[PDB]
Amino acid sequence: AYRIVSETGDKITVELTLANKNTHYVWNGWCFDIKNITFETTGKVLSIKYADGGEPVYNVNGNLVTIDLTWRGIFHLNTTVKIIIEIQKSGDNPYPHNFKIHYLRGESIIYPTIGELPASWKPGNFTLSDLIADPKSYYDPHVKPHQNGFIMYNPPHPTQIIIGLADIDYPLNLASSARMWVPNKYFAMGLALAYEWFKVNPNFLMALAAKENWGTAVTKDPAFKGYKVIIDEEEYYWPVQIDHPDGIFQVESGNFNQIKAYYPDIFPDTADHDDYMKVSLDPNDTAWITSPIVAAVSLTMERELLYAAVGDKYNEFLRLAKDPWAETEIIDFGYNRGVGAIEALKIFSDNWEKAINAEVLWKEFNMEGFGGHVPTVINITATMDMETERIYDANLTWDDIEYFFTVVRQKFFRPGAISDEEWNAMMRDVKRAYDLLSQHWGGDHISYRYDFLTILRVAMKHWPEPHIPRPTGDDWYYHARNYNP
Ligand SMILES: CC(=O)N[C@@H]1[C@@H](O)[C@H](O[C@@H]2O[C@H](CO)[C@@H](O[C@@H]3O[C@H](CO)[C@@H](O[C@@H]4O[C@H](CO)[C@@H](O[C@@H]5O[C@H](CO)[C@@H](O)[C@H](O)[C@H]5NC(C)=O)[C@H](O)[C@H]4NC(C)=O)[C@H](O)[C@H]3NC(C)=O)[C@H](O)[C@H]2NC(C)=O)[C@@H](CO)O[C@H]1O
């Protein structure tokens, strides 16, 4: 909001009022972190001061003027900042105009839409055709190979989830061989939500968990001792530290609390590290659902962090780099070593020409990671992507579907993001969509591979827009402002 304070002779004074009007919590409005403010004037700037005292840093670039709120750029609930601008009249456009608030968040960040519900779809009593565009491609068992890394830029199928359960010839954690394995259906639905919400490749999370703590992989290796697991009447070993508080993704307590502060819209105030990550042999453990999602958020944080600093050069880097897996290598490296490690690489600045021309990015920059973390994850991901013969599937009962959303309701979002009525209304849509899609299989169940993405999209139609909230808060403001990769 802006207002003319004083107009007299050759001097114009405008009061720009910025605020977070929200008194209570609202979606993506619990806090606002402002990078900078830009307005336009042909007149010369005399003084820019706060109304309550002091003054912000401002920069003039011709008609464009960039105001820096510095330590006042953070806007929590019920917080107003008024800026008084004094201009000496000059040119044909003296009045300050075209005010643009720039949030501390990469505006050029992209999240690939995996698929969409048919345009005819409506909340209430939709038909089967309102769920399925064409029955041919929807139930098409044929598999198309892909080469996606961390982000699914080009999904193999619009409505299907393709988890490549391929054999791994690569020595995973000093093992002879390895076999990709989904522990249970609830963890799979976890990956699916992480895939539809934050556009994260399920194969990448599978590969990550395998390297971190054998969470998603079994082996024939006699040397490795673990739990007895049988696939196709063959004995396999599952060497997972199931008691590890950091879970199968090895998400540290410090990283958990950090992204918790970054994303209040995602995490409730009661979000505890152990309850969210620590899984067990019991498939009914809620952490089977939460841990792949928490990992997806923590991974997303890094991508959001780079975008906030690098800005537009991120997209330029993706299209000009000679390494196809480049982004995946960076993100995976920052997951294991930390975001500071990526920053210290100075890839997007000092070593721009070296990384952008690197055929293999992790080899030149020595981004091996602990125990060859980065090369392991990439190769397994590539293998799972290349797998077309053996794709994961499961039978999801209604009790499975309802349990999943129950856990989501309890472990994610804040009170007020989704009303009780809006949720019950969403469930009726999910219930109907389940019933309609179950007919193809006999009414006993739906396919995780073929139907569950549709189930999510139906549910997410009632989820607050935009679905992906902004990283915000005090901690995010300092880190993202000073981040220089
Ligand atoms: C040779 C071989 O193959 N051996 C295998 C072996 O790989 C297997 O053991 C398991 O290996 C993995 C590593 O590959 C072990 O895991 C962890 O993994 C964690 C997640 O990647 C990682 O946590 C990250 O560490 C960063 C550095 O501290 C953190 O960044 C920092 O966070 C702070 C607070 O947020 C912040 O203040 C700092 O600024 C920030 N630092 C920087 C530079 O920015 C980061 O937050 C954190 N990430 C997350 C998501 O939590 C651990 O560092 C890493 N530890 C080690 C020693 O590598 C895993 O623990 C191993 N498993 C077990 C049971 O120990 C093994 C399979 O079990 O088989 C062998 O054969």
DSSP string over 260-301: HHH-TTTS-TT--HHHHH---S-TT-THHHHHHHHHHHHHHH
Q: Which residues contact 310 (CB under 8 A, 6 or more apart)?
A: 106, 317, 348, 485
How many CB atoms lie under 10 A from the CB of residue 327?
A: 20
Cα gap 344→289, rounded to integer Å = 34
Q: Which sign, positive or negative, has the C-alpha torsion 358, 364, 370, 372?
A: positive
CA 479–ligand 1 middle distance (angstroms): 21
* Tokens representing residue 59 in the block: 């920069």
How far, in Å, CA of 329 to CA of 327, rounded?
5
Q: How far apart are CA 356 and CA 341, in angstroms?
A: 18
CB 220 within 8 A of CB 203: no
- CB count, 10 Å around CB of 346? 15
Q: Give every CB contact of residue 465 below 8 A, 6+ residues apart in sequence.
A: none
Residue that the structure tokens 């009007």 belong to: 21
Please name the residue whose Cα sits nearest to atom 30 of ligand 1: 338
Instruction: Find how far residue 482's CA is from the centre of its chain.
Output: 21
Residue 240 Cα to ligand 1 midpoint, Å, equals 15
Question: What's the 398 CA to ligand 1 centre distance in angstroms?
Answer: 37
Q: Are 291 and 251 in contact (CB under 8 A)?
A: yes
Whole-number Å distance, alpha carbon 362 to ligand 1 midpoint, is 17
Cβ neighbours around 168 below 10 Å, total: 20
Q: State which amino acid sits at residue 414.
A: R
Residue 391 per-residue DSSP state: B
355, 364 contact by CB (below 8 A): yes
Query: Could you identify the atom of ligand 1 that is nearest to the CA of residue 372?
Result: 3
Count CB-CB contacts under 10 A for residue 286.
20
With beta carbons less than 8 A apart as the criterion, state whether 277 and 287 touch. Answer: yes
DSSP state of 72: G
How far is residue 167 from each of residues 120, 171, 182, 379, 384, measured CA to CA in Å? Answer: 42, 11, 13, 12, 8
Residue among 71, 288, 275, 338 at smallest CA distance from 188: 288
Q: What is the token pair recorded at 209?
A: 């968990």
E strand residue ranges, 174-282? 178-180, 217-218, 227-231, 234-238
Gap between the Cα atoms of 416 and 419, Å rounded:
6
Q: Give the phi and the psi of residue 79 in degrees, each rounded to 5.
A: -140, 115
Q: Is the sign of the CA dihedral 191, 415, 111, 481 positive or negative? A: negative
User: Tokens in use for 104?
Assistant: 């501390």
Q: How far apart are CA 377 and CA 367, in angstroms?
A: 12
Beta strands in 333-430, from DSSP E residues, in sequence order: 395-396
- Rounded to whole angstroms, the Cα distance separating 364 from 366 reads 5
CA distance 37 to 5: 19
Q: Which residues is the chain interrupted after (C–N above 2.5 Å)?
A: none
| Interval between CA 57 and ligand 1 midpoint (Å) | 40
> Are 224 and 237 contacting, i.e. CB atoms less than 8 angstroms apart?
yes
Pocket lined around ligand 1, Cβ cut-off 6 Å: 173-174, 211-214, 241, 244, 250-252, 254-255, 258, 298, 335-341, 370-373
Closest CA to 464 of 432, 426, 434: 426
Report the alpha-carbon distance of residue 77 to residue 20 in Å, rounded: 6
DSSP state for residue 200 in the 8-state scheme = B
Angstrom CA distances, 261 to 12, 26, 52, 398, 474, stand at 41, 16, 29, 34, 8
φ and ψ at 284, to 5 degrees?
A: -75, 0
Whether the Cβ atoms of residue 85 and residue 45 lie closer than 8 Å to each other: yes
> Please, which experimental method was used?
X-ray
- Within 9-73, strands assigned E span 11-20, 31-40, 44-50, 57-61, 64-68
Ligand 1 site-directed mutation target among 241, 252, 476, most atoms within 8 Å of CB: 252
- Rounded to an integer, what distance in angstroms lies between the CA atom of residue 429 and that of residue 455? 9
Whole-angstrom Cα distance, residue 166 to residue 85? Answer: 63
CA distance 126 to 429: 9
Is 246 in contact with 197 (CB distance < 8 Å)?
Answer: no
CA distance 334 to 457: 30
Residue 452: partners with Cβ closer than 8 Å, 6 or more residues away: 161, 189, 192, 396, 446
336 Cα: distance to centroid of ligand 1 (angstroms): 5
Q: Which two tokens stand for residue 279?
A: 């899984």
Q: Omega of the bond prior to 96 within 30 degrees of 0, cis?
A: no
Cis peptide before 264 (omega within 30 of 0): no
Q: In what order do the strands lie in the sheet with 167-168?
A: 167-168, 178-180, 217-218
Nearest CA to ligand 1 atom 67: 213
Lookup: tokens for 88: 């000496």
Q: Which of 203, 206, 210, 151 has its CA nearest to residue 385?
A: 203
Looking up tokens 């490795």 gives 224
Task: From residue 424, give the alpha-carbon distance in Å to each of 21, 285, 340, 419.
Answer: 29, 24, 43, 9
Q: What is the resolution of this structure in A?
A: 2.6
Q: Encoding tokens for residue 311? A: 């800005």
Q: CA 338, CA 258: separation in Å to the nearest integer?
A: 12
